[PDB]
Each structure stands twice: as structure tokens, then as C-alpha cells.
Design a protein around this nucleic acid. Structure first.
Lengths: 98, 110, 126, 154, 96, 80
RNA sequence: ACCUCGGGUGGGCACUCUAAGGAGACUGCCGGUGACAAACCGGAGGAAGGUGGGGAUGACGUCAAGUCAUCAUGGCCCUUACGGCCAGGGCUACACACGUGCUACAAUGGUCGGUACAAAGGGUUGCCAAGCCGCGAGGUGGAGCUAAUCCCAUAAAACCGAUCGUAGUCCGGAUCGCAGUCUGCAACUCGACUGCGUGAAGUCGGAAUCGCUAGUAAUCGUGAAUCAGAAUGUCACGGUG
């Protein structure tokens, strides 16, 4: 859809917006020398943030097409747009071989 | 009665202690380590002296006549509460989260 | 001098074989020959081109082999020493061309192809 | 079917100095377990030298030629009647028929200590009371009931 | 000196553009040394709606190439870097 | 599961709708869509309306229900 | 030469290796055979002998074969919802039947103790060593590292010694109770592994039916993509043969 790319655009904003406090709240919990009173109130600040901030909510879709399945991260393309753009000599250094 | 149950003969000790039903294989390797009985000899070649020390270890883990009693109440606690793990455990379905549509035949028979 | 360099490859192995006059000194990777190849028939297969050309007692042998499999390194030495024996002349050329020792075995492993599961095995249909 | 098939050769037995035994060793190997099968064939070779004072190659040389048959059937159907024809076994083929019959009856011997199963097989066939010798002679008897079909619609 | 590009009809044709254009200015630069090659296979499915056993597999290469000076006294190649870069060659400097 | 470094789990809005709702005692069921949280000995004997998926079902909290979460007591699928 | 005995070091450019550029194989040559003409059967030499082995490359067309849910578009309908937004649930339900795939059914084995040899690949939003604490999965710890350097990373089968005596078993591991660690805001429906305990069916499997002509079938491991987490599948590389 087009309305479905648009709702997973703003997830990428809200993850990259906060992005620093959640490093600190997970720095407090991960220490064995940390006190649980400093841990328990640190648990409060995680769950009162909106949940669309973790990377697990983020879903790497194809950038030109939007199809979820068949994505590679050494490119930005889908499974079936990568073929049509490679036969036209665009992708540099890419050939067939055996 | 011999050690809680009858124990076979002409066998090594760790294999012989396996039938006591509450001690597996790794646990019976500790009992011969803690007491000092050599597993490499048979149970025939042993002395009638130190078997109490083997019988001391049986009085510290569990006994199958009461092991099956107490594990039933672990089942029975799950059933009478009506929790989901005891909900299917009343009926006969798998428990841990296996697949049910096909192939779960060792809880339903032929 | 009299040092003779011999190489030989079989089943992705590679053996440096040096050959010089000596008295039965067979040493491989600073190990004895009976110690290196543990319990196999190829302990004698490395001697088979040597005892064919009746020079089993007349040379030092220094072998360094890398890569390959267990019994693939033993074939690398057997191909390797035959190239080192023919640096002398071609008197033993006909004694080895007829023996079938000089030709490198070209039979290498084959790649997995799509649709198939092995190199040539394919799943069952009905 | 253009005729293609060339010949590949395996002849290696350094610890005993033999040629028939190496080809027999390949009929015992399962899935490339050669070093396992090598010590079982020698493991059933020394028990014969333990049993008989003669060199156990000759026991193996005699045990082949009382399992190896002479003629056998060949169900060549005329296309409307199923016939069988007793045919002369080619001299190259008749070695491998005995060695393949020998191993398959060793596996159903049902003893302990696996090299003793093959040990008893090579002892019997120097006499004739083996199951491989009884399987040999029974197929010999199948040819003479089949002997009417030797040339005629054959 | 180390060089990275995508085809051997550039990167092994720009070393002579550096070896000649540095040994001319007096300093000694030895012969270039090859390295192992990056090879990356990409097996992609080819049909839009599914038919699995029709596939197609590509490969992207990366050629490496290492130079070696002896006596550093020339800043001539430092100005002649925009010349020696042509289309797809990257040069990290290790002036030994 | 949920290893003992990070010991308990309960939801934040559930806690203020219980701990303050202890101070005025049990005269109402607690209607909550949350199912990820456990029950606790601060909550022995309450009445919770756990979301089935299309309705809420009542829960009689006992003392021997403490370790298990709320999910084992709401249904999902019928199979009549 | 050096050494502390590690190419450790000076050194060397012999080598292995790496990758650029070349030669080599054409029925060329010998004999026979054919209409002596294509060719065929033998022979020498040669690393290779008769398209050396493998791979990519699929003609005019067929089945109105498949896809409007990858994308693009003619038309048709919805446009106070057949469009948007957010919670929980669901696709993982379950007398049954069919398709592929893995283990097993043991003694060419099973355990314990030693010990030997690979290719190929990924890693500065990462790999995460030494030391270190844990029955064990791990926890600390922070190096080295932008890669023939550092890490992933210990190949397994084989071999050697021991016990095991062919018993539904020192076989097999399903189920299940209990106890743990890891990721993630969150392991109830619904994750993966670890400990301990319990131990099933299964003693080679009808009518039928499929794969394969040589580094091949058969058997043993390793890696990558997708990926916070999660492979018995897919793709890929080697051992023994």
C-alpha cells in the first residue's frame, strides 16, 4: 500500500528521536554493581515511553518498492527489483559467474 | 528392600544403581564418588558393609513409591486451578507447546 | 648440488619433497614416517615409486606437506617424489610412465547445483 | 545405448601381498569405512590361521570355488510368455557372485564378535556345508528344469 | 600503498600509471603484490509469483593491489592522485 | 524465562489501579486488557476482568496462583 | 647466522602460495579400415586424446498454464468507509488422510581416556580474546581489529587404550516434572538452549515406488544469506570413498 509505507516511516523517526535515554536506562540495569533501587525506578522510565522506540518494532522494508519479504542489506532493494536494475548495468561490480 | 527395590547382579555399580528410580546416570556417578565404591567391580564382589552408605544416599534424594505420589500433586495442582497448562493436561493434549494438527501421537495412541 | 626439489598435488594437498643422497632418512614435518601416518596401508604406498626404481636405501628424504586430507597427503607425496626422481634423467621415465605414477589425478570434487541436493542426487517425487 | 564403459582398476594390498583380497575388501566396506573393514577382513583372516595351519589365502582360494556357480537363469520374456533361459556365466562375472553371496550370509550368521561370523563362512566352503554352498547348488538345480528352454524361444 | 576497485581492467592498469610516474622521479618503488580477492555470491529468486527451482546467482568481486616504495622523497604522486584515480579506484596510502 | 537478575514484572497503570484500589477495598472487578503481567502477594484475593480477545472474563484470585501470569486463566480458542 | 629454539630474529626471493599475462590439444602424428571421403578402430608421445571434467547459454512455438497480492495499466465498484488510527486475539486450534525430511531400530556398534589432518566465508553501529567466576548454558573482563595481521574458530569421521557381550539393552530418545541462563517494553496462548529426573513406540518395516554411471552414490562435519531473538529447510565448501 501507500498508507502502509507512511505509517512505517514515522516509526523510523521515533526510534531515532529518543535513542539515547534508552541506552542509559539499559546501562543502569546491565550492571551487576548497580543497586536495585536504582534499577526499579529505571524500569519506570522504560514502560512510560511510547513503545515504538525499540529496534524490534522497526521493519526494514524495500526502499523503492515497499515489499517486506525478500530484502537484502548489502543493497536497499527487493528480491525482484534488484534483478531488473542489475541487468541494466546500474549496480557496479555485479556480474554473473560460476 | 535390597536398596528400595531389587538390584541386578553381574553388573557394574553405576549401571546397577540406575534401577533405583530417582537416580539417573550422572547422579549415580556422584554416589560412587562420595562413598568411594569402585564402579569397575561388580556388585557381587562388593562387601556387605558399605551398602548402608549407599543406602544413606537413597534416604537423601527421593523414593519412587513416593516420587510418583508427589509428582501427581504437581499435576493435580495444575488441573484443579484450571490454568491453561492443566487445562489441556486434563484432556490429553500436548503441554509444552508442540504442534497439534498432526503428528502428536504419543499422547493420543494409535 | 645434489638437492632435488619435488612437488605434487592430489585432492587439494601440496607436498614439498626434497631429495638428496643419504641413508634411509625418511622424515616428514619433523616426524617419522610410521608415526605420522597412523595405522594405514598408505605407509607403504609412499614407498611404492621408491622401491620400484630400486633406490630405497640410497637417499635422504625430507617432506613438508600442507592442506588436504589424511590419505590425500599420502597421494601428494607419491606424485611428489616421482617428479623429484625424474630430475636425474629419463632412464626411469619409461619405468614410471608405464607404471602410471607420473600423471596427476585430476578428479576433484563437484559443486552443488540448484534443484538438486547433492552434486547429482535430487529429491523424490511421485 | 552406444557402448562406452571402459575399465577402472583397484589392486592394492601391501600388508599381505594379495590382489583378490583387495577386491574382496571393497565388497565389505560400507559408506567408505575402509579402515574399519580392513581390520575385520584381517580379523577373520588370522582366525583361520589360528584354526588351520595352512596359509589362509588358500582357504579363501578354495572357498571361492565352491560358492562360485557355473550356469544360471535369465528371464528374457518373449513378449507374450514369461520364459527363463539357463545361460553360461561369463568367466569375469563368476568371481563377484561368490564374494557377494558370502558377505550377505555372514551378516545373518547371528553370532557375537563380527569377525567370527565371516570366519565360519570361509571354513565351511572348503567342505561344502555352508549356506552359500547350499544357495549355490540350489540355483544349479533350477537350470535343468529350465534346460528345455535353452535354445528354443530363448 | 593499497588499492581497491571492481575490475582488473582498471586497477591493474593504474599501477603502471603509478610505478612509471614515481620511479621516473628518482625514488625506488618495487613491483606490486597481489592479494586475495573478495568474492560474494548472491543467489536470488527469479519468478514474481512462486516457482522455486528457477534461480539465478551472481557474484561481486573486489580486486586488491599493494605497492611498495623504498625511499620516500617524492611528493610528486601526492599531487598526481587525481590523475591516478580515474573512475572507481580507491587508494589508501601506506608510504613505506 | 525472565531470569532472576530482572526479577519481577508488573504493568505501571495496573499497579496504580490496584495499590490505590486496595485502600478502597474489593467492591468492583478490575477490567484490564493487559495479560503480560504476573500476580503478586500484594494482590491475593482480587477480582480481575481479563480480556478474552472479544470480552472480559472474571478471575477469582487465590493464594496459590502467584507465579503464573494472567494468560493461563483467560481462554483463546473454543474447540467445542 | 641468530635464538629463549617460536620464521622467534636478522635475512633470503629458491620455494609454496597469491594473480596478472601467456604457451599446451589440433584426429596433430603411426598403422589398419572407408568410395580412401567424410569418418571409424587401434598406436606412440604427452600433465591432459579424441566435444579433458564442470558451469552459464535454452530456436519457431505450445498449454487463453501462473501472477491485477511485487510493480505497471484498460474497465468496473467503495469514497461518513470496501478508506485511516490503537489496543488485545488470530494465522502455531485438531478423531483424521496424503506429500516431502530427519533420527533410530544396534556389536562394520556404545561409552571413557588420550591424539591426527581441511576448504570456504563473515566481522569499526560489529567480532567481542587473555584472565576470571559458573555442574552447564554463561557472567564479568576488555584487548586486538577495519583486515592474507585481530577475532569468529575447537573441523568431525579415522587412529590408540579401556570397559560394554547382542539384553527392548551402558539400545533408542519421544513425552513429562522440577530448576536455570539469553535477547526483547514484554517468553500465558507462542521462542531457543542448559541442568536434574522419568523413560515410551521402535527388533530393518505390505501391495507398491523413486534417486544415481565416478571423486559419483553412501556417510562425517563447517560456513553464509534472512536475522533483537529463533533451521532437521535453502544455498555453499571440504573429509573418507
Amino acid at each position: 500500500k501507500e498508507s502502509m509505507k507512511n505509517r512505517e516511516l514515522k516509526r523510523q523517526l521515533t526510534v531515532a528521536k529518543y535513542a539515547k535515554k534508552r541506552a542509559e536506562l539499559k546501562a543502569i540495569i546491565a550492571n551487576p554493581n548497580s543497586s536495585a533501587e536504582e534499577r526499579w525506578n529505571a524500569q519506570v522510565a522504560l514502560q512510560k515511553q511510547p513503545r515504538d522506540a525499540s529496534a524490534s518494532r522497526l521493519r526494514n522494508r524495500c526502499r523503492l518498492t515497499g515489499r517486506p519479504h525478500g530484502f537484502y542489506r548489502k543493497f536497499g532493494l527487493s528480491r525482484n527489483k534488484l534483478r531488473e536494475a542489475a541487468m541494466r548495468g546500474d549496480v557496479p561490480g555485479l556480474v554473473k559467474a560460476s | 528392600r535390597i536398596a528400595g527395590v531389587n538390584i541386578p547382579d553381574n553388573k557394574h555399580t553405576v549401571i546397577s544403581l540406575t534401577y533405583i528410580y530417582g537416580v539417573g546416570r550422572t547422579t549415580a556417578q556422584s554416589i560412587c564418588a562420595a562413598t568411594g565404591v569402585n564402579p569397575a567391580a561388580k556388585i557381587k564382589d562388593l562387601s556387605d558393609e558399605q551398602i548402608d552408605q549407599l543406602r544413606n544416599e537413597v534416604a537423601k534424594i527421593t523414593t519412587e513409591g513416593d516420587l510418583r505420589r508427589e509428582i501427581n500433586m504437581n499435576i493435580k495442582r495444575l488441573m484443579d486451578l484450571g490454568c491453561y497448562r492443566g487445562l489441556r493436561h486434563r484432556r490429553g493434549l500436548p503441554v509444552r507447546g508442540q504442534r497439534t494438527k498432526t503428528n502428536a501421537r504419543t499422547r493420543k495412541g494409535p | 648440488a645434489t638437492q632435488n626439489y619435488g612437488t605434487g598435488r592430489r585432492k587439494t594437498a601440496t607436498a614439498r619433497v626434497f631429495l638428496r643422497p643419504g641413508t634411509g632418512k625418511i622424515s616428514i614435518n619433523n616426524r617419522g614416517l610410521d608415526q605420522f601416518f597412523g595405522r594405514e596401508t598408505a605407509r607403504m604406498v609412499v614407498r611404492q615409486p621408491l622401491e620400484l626404481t630400486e633406490t630405497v636405501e640410497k637417499f635422504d628424504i625430507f617432506v613438508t606437506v600442507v592442506g588436504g586430507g589424511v590419505s590425500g597427503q599420502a597421494g601428494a607425496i607419491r606424485h611428489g617424489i616421482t617428479r623429484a626422481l625424474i630430475e636425474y634423467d629419463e632412464t626411469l621415465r619409461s619405468s614410471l610412465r608405464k607404471a602410471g605414477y607420473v600423471t596427476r589425478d585430476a578428479r576433484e570434487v563437484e559443486r552443488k547445483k540448484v534443484g538438486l541436493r547433492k552434486a547429482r542426487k535430487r529429491p523424490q517425487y511421485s | 545405448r552406444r557402448r562406452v564403459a571402459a575399465k577402472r582398476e583397484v589392486l592394492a594390498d601391501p600388508k599381505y601381498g594379495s590382489q583378490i583380497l583387495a577386491k574382496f575388501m571393497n565388497h565389505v566396506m560400507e559408506s567408505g569405512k575402509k579402515a574399519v573393514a580392513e581390520r575385520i577382513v584381517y580379523g577373520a583372516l588370522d582366525k583361520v590361521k589360528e584354526r588351520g595351519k595352512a596359509d589362509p589365502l588358500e582357504t579363501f582360494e578354495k572357498a571361492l570355488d565352491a560358492i562360485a556357480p557355473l550356469v544360471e537363469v535369465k528371464s528374457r520374456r518373449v513378449g507374450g510368455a514369461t520364459y527363463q533361459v539357463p545361460v553360461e556365466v561369463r568367466p569375469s562375472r563368476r568371481n563377484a557372485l561368490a564374494m557377494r553371496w558370502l558377505v550377505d550370509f555372514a551378516r545373518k550368521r547371528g553370532e557375537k564378535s563380527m569377525a567370527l561370523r565371516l570366519a565360519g563362512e570361509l571354513l565351511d566352503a572348503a567342505e561344502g556345508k555352508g549356506a552359500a554352498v547350499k544357495k549355490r547348488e540350489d540355483v544349479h538345480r533350477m537350470a535343468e528344469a529350465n534346460k528345455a528352454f535353452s535354445h528354443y524361444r530363448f | 600503498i593499497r588499492l581497491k576497485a571492481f575490475d582488473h581492467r582498471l586497477i591493474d592498469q593504474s599501477t603502471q600509471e603509478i610505478v612509471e610516474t614515481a620511479k621516473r622521479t628518482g625514488a625506488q618503488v618495487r613491483g606490486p603484490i597481489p592479494l586475495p580477492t573478495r568474492k560474494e555470491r548472491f543467489t536470488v529468486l527469479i519468478s514474481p509469483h512462486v516457482n522455486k527451482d528457477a534461480r539465478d546467482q551472481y557474484e561481486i568481486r573486489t580486486h586488491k593491489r599493494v605497492l611498495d616504495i623504498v625511499q620516500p622523497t617524492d611528493k610528486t604522486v601526492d599531487a598526481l592522485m587525481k590523475l591516478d584515480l580515474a573512475a572507481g579506484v580507491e587508494v589508501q596510502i601506506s608510504l613505506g | 524465562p525472565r531470569s532472576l537478575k530482572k526479577g519481577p514484572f508488573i504493568d505501571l497503570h495496573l499497579l496504580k489501579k490496584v495499590e490505590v484500589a486496595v485502600e478502597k477495598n474489593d467492591r468492583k472487578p478490575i477490567k484490564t486488557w493487559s495479560r503480560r503481567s504476573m500476580i503478586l502477594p500484594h494482590m491475593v484475593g482480587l477480582t480481575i476482568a481479563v480480556h478474552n480477545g472479544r470480552q472480559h472474563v472474571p478471575v477469582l484470585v487465590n493464594e496459590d496462583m502467584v507465579g503464573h501470569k494472567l494468560g493461563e486463566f483467560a481462554a483463546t480458542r473454543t474447540y467445542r
